[PDB]
Amino acid sequence: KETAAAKFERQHMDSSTSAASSSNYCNQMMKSRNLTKDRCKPVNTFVHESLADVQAVCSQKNVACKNGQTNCYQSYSTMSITDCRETGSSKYPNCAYKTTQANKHIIVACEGNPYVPVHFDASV
């Protein structure tokens, strides 16, 4: 019965590494986190920080979500992230991703008891 909180962690958290070490990281992780079974998800960001540090963003800078919701929050600090997005070649079910390492602020939507991230909105 996967909760939105848990779906966030499966799609976006990778606390086991400080950054993507190889150019194949997104192909391996998108598959292994189950993000290509229904379709190729076009864009997905992984965050290489502890869970507590990411959950804490829900008490940091309140901003508008891209869709106008008001329950989005931007990290005060940059975070280590991996941008995964489909390449030109990518075509379901043969998904293909480019791996880009970056240091950026994250913007997430939060909800719940506990009040935790449930959607990754953007990096800036």
Ligand SMILES: Nc1nc2c(ncn2[C@H]2C[C@H](O)[C@@H](COP(=O)(O)O)O2)c(=O)[nH]1
């Ligand atoms: N839903 C969702 N959107 C993402 C995620 N990572 C980045 N984005 C969004 C932010 C931007 O709206 C868009 C990419 O835009 P750009 O970098 O300009 O091509 O993807 C993610 O993990 N989930």
Ligand SMILES: Nc1nc2c(ncn2[C@H]2C[C@H](O)[C@@H](COP(=O)(O)O)O2)c(=O)[nH]1
């Ligand atoms: N609770 C909640 N879930 C959302 C929001 N936007 C997208 N989702 C859900 C739909 C999908 O199950 C999932 C997609 O993951 P993400 O890449 O984090 O947007 O997030 C939102 O604003 N609030």
